[PDB]
Amino acid sequence: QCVPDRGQQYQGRLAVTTHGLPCLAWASAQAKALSKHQDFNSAVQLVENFCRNPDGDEEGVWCYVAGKPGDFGYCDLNYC
Amino acid sequence: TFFNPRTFGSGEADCGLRPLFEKKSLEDKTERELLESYIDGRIVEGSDAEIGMSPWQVMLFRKSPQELLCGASLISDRWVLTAAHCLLYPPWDKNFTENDLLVRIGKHSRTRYERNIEKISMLEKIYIHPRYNWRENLDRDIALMKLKKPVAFSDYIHPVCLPDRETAASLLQAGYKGRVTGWQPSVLQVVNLPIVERPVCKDSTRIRITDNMFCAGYKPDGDAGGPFVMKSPFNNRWYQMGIVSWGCDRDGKYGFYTHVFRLKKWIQKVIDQF
């Protein structure tokens, strides 16, 4: 089936970006530092290193791939 | 106030009211244009700014050798707003940090030292949006720079206001005009441009446009980091609605700007902390 609401309800386990980069754990120190000043929806569960869309990004789910600004990538999902 | 003076510094309460204009109940020569729409096909080009017309204008310079790098804006007596790509862009091996830069505030002329007018300041720290998307489309192209020491306001140096939800809803609408300033003229150049509908902006480029951007200008046949401002007809204050990101002159030009209100939460969190 197709993923709705641009993945804001996604519970999957996809942990790699569209360009083949492995996702970092949301609980990792570098990830938390990048997330610190952003505005996330507490409803979205940042589990393991699975792709999620906590900020409501129009492009869809994504994940961090490193620890510097801009080090994130979107994940290949099928949206409705 | 939206910000805490303890961390934000002074200036919010009196933001957006220029000492040489609003404070003297005077209007500059072209702000009337922000309310009128010409359809005579007149060429839209940058013209020389009036003295003290954009007191929040900030120039970002490479410390040594001295070289103008980008524009920026003063939002308080110690915080400056600019575009993230002006400081960080990995594809070009660009990664400017606080000690590699300096800012010049209150300037009118780009080429000479303005004694008893301009102020030069060093930076204490730079903050780049964690999800500034340099790998793809420059989404969230925004950065904050904290001054080493507070700058003193004057007739030539004064902070601009940042919009609230209500202000953004009322002013940032297709058709309304905004003003961009930047720097072969020797003085600060000004140009007023109309905001263009998202679908039309989209249609002009292959780059993915986001809700964190907006565009203005005219269809084709820079002052990156600088401000795109609008004057409120409701409180008479100037607000910075955008930051020149990519894409503001007269062949035919669509400029793209960082949607400041969309990123205000981030600004608040950063300042509320350092």
Q: Does A59 touch chain B (CB under 8 A)?
A: yes
Nearest-Cα distance to chain A for B22, in Å, is 35
Shortest Cα–Cα distance, B183 to chain A (Å)? 28
Cβ distance A34 to B130 less than 8 Å, yes or no, reads yes
> Which of B251, B198, B255 is closest to B226 using CA atoms?
B255
Q: β-pairing, A72-74 with B57-62?
A: unpaired
Could you tell me the resolution of this structure in angstroms? Answer: 1.9
Sequence-ordered list of residues with C-beta below 8 angstroms from that of B46, at least 6 positions apart, any chain: B182, B185, B189, B190, B191, B249
- Give the mutation candidate from B94, B127, B131, B264 for the A interface (greatest A CB count, under 10 A): B131
Mention every residue, 6+ apart, whose C-beta is less than 8 A from residue B9.
B76, B77, B78, B79, B150
B274 vs B263: CA distance, rounded Å: 17
Q: Which residue of B has its CA nearest to A32?
A: B130
Q: Do B131 and A37 touch (CB under 8 A)?
A: no
The residue ranges of every structural domain in chain B are 41-54+160-261, 55-159+262-274
Per DSSP, which regions of B96-154 are E strands? 101-105, 119-128, 143-147
Q: Is A7 on the interface with B (CB under 8 A)?
A: no
Range 197-216 of B in CB contact (< 8 A) with A: 208, 210-211
This structure was determined by: X-ray
Mutate to test the interface with B, among A26, A37, A71 (most CBs of B within 10 A): A37
Determine the residue among B93, B97, B125, B133 to mutate to test chain A binding: the one whose Cβ has the most chain A Cβ atoms within 10 Å: B133
Long-range contacts of B259-264 (CB under 8 A, 24+ apart): B259/B172, B259/B211, B259/B212, B259/B213, B259/B214, B260/B81, B260/B142, B260/B162, B260/B163, B261/B162, B261/B163, B261/B164, B261/B165, B261/B167, B261/B168, B261/B172, B262/B211, B262/B212, B263/B129, B263/B140, B263/B142, B263/B212, B264/B162, B264/B163
Pairwise CA distance, residues B166 & B234, whole Å: 11
Is the fold of B41-54+160-261 the same as that of B55-159+262-274? yes
Choose the closest CB to A69 out of B130, B269, B273. Answer: B130
Contact B193, B44 (CB under 8 A): yes
Does residue B129 belong to the interface with chain A, where contact is any CB pair within 8 Å?
yes
Residue A38 class from Cβ within 10 Å (0-12 exposed, 13-18 middle, 19+ buried)? middle
Q: What is the DSSP letter of B91?
A: G
What one-character-per-residue DSSP string does B16-69 give?
T--TTTGGGT---SSGGGGT----S------EEPPTTS-TTEEEEEETTTTEEE
Q: Which of A39, A69, A72 sits opposite B265 (nearest CB)?
A: A39
Superfamily of domain B55-159+262-274: Trypsin-like serine proteases (2.40.10.10)
Specify the CATH number for A1-80; select among 3.30.1460.30, 2.40.20.10, 3.40.228.10, 2.102.10.10.
Answer: 2.40.20.10
**Chain A within 8 Å of B90 (Cβ-Cβ)?**
yes
In chain A, DSSP finds a helix count (H) and a strand count (E) of 1, 2
Q: How far is it, in rounded angstroms, from Cα B235 to Cα B187?
A: 29
Are the Cβ atoms of B210 and A59 closer than 8 angstroms?
Answer: yes
The second-level CATH assignment, the architecture, of B41-54+160-261 is Beta Barrel (2.40)
Decide if A16 contacts A73 (C-beta within 8 A): no
